[PDB]
């Protein structure tokens, strides 16, 4: 049943400045010491990502994808909820990450007004059309745990990305520096049409909520210049939407561009109105003597 603990005064959404982070492998192709440009749904650099501090679980929309960066010292965040209506009317999807395995079910579930984590998240289930075992689990002291999970949906596939790296420095709930690539772990032929997103938080009250934060960042179609190293890993990338130095690096693919002037873009001031100008009306048709006549015959 729906519950709500005390001391939950208020936590309005916030915003942070995500640094260069959120680049994933767009394809299963090996590249050694060569650059590559691709057009997919990436995360823009120096964007504005939400700052939901897990110290509240709103229903945020799923336009093209999310980043979902998390930094915590526990395993409270161990689930997600996908769907278009989040009820028993349409199809739904959930990704629960148990302490020993991961489960995914596309049953037509019925979620309450506040899901929380057992299976006390949905009231009435329904028939599933897909299930997977997920043998390994997806989600020390000073070193905390940093995890990020990219979710997309092109035609029917989910193509979940993931990368976990221990963070060694402590910061007031801020994204760390450096670079990190998202490795594709599992693919889903589920084929669901999702338009919203909902997380799943554990409680373990027996209140002990710990400290965490999920950073939901929307994805936009960009053009990145990857830096495949000699072992196939990615060292850095270019957003190609920052200061014109970035676009110069895109059109002159390198990272040690020499001195000089280069033609990169083409400006174009774009419209701002849909003016249509036709002449005056004149000589209206005789529809006033055929719809407002006096007498007909038969």
């Amino acid at each position: 049943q729906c519950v709500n603990l005390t001391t939950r005064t208020q936590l309005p959404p916030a915003y942070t400045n995500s640094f260069t982070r959120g680049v994933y492998y767009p394809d299963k192709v090996f590249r050694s010491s060569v650059l590559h440009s691709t057009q997919d749904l990436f995360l823009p650099f120096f964007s504005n990502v939400t700052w939901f501090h897990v110290i509240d679980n709103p229903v945020l929309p799923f336009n093209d994808g999310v980043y979902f960066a998390s930094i915590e010292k526990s395993n409270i965040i161990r689930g997600w909820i996908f769907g278009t209506t989040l009820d028993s009317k349409t199809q739904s999807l959930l990704i629960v990450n148990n302490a020993t395995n991961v489960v995914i079910k596309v049953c037509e579930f019925q979620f309450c007004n506040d899901p929380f984590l057992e299976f006390r998240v949905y009231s009435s289930a329904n028939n599933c059309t897909f299930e997977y075992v997920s043998q390994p689990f997806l989600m020390q002291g000073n070193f905390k745990n940093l995890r990020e999970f990219v979710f997309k949906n092109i035609d029917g596939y989910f193509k979940i990305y993931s990368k976990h790296t221990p963070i060694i420095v402590r910061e007031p709930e801020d994204l760390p520096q450096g670079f990190s690539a998202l490795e594709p772990l599992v693919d889903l032929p589920i084929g669901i049409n999702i338009t919203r997103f909902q997380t799943l938080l554990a409680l373990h009250r027996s209140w002990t909520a710990g400290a965490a934060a999920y950073y939901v960042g929307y994805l936009q179609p960009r053009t990145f210049l990857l830096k495949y190293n000699e072992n196939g890993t990615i060292t850095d990338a270019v957003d190609c939407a920052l200061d014109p130095l970035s676009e110069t690096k895109c059109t002159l693919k390198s990272f040690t561009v020499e001195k000089g002037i280069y033609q990169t873009s083409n400006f174009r001031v774009q419209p701002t109105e849909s003016i249509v100008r036709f002449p005056n009306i004149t000589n209206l048709c005789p529809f006033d003597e055929v719809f407002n006549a006096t007498r007909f015959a038969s």
């Binding site: 014109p244 130095l245 561009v257 000089g260 400006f267």
Partner: peptide, 29 residues
């Protein structure tokens, strides 16, 4: 305009065919 990614990272955009009123901002020919 870029001195190169070896001594600095500052750039200088140069639009062509603009009177600096349709985009330090100087007006050259």
């Amino acid at each position: 305009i870029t001195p190169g990614t070896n001594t600095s990272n500052q750039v200088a955009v140069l639009y062509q065919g603009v009177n600096c009123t349709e985009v330090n901002v100087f007006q050259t020919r």
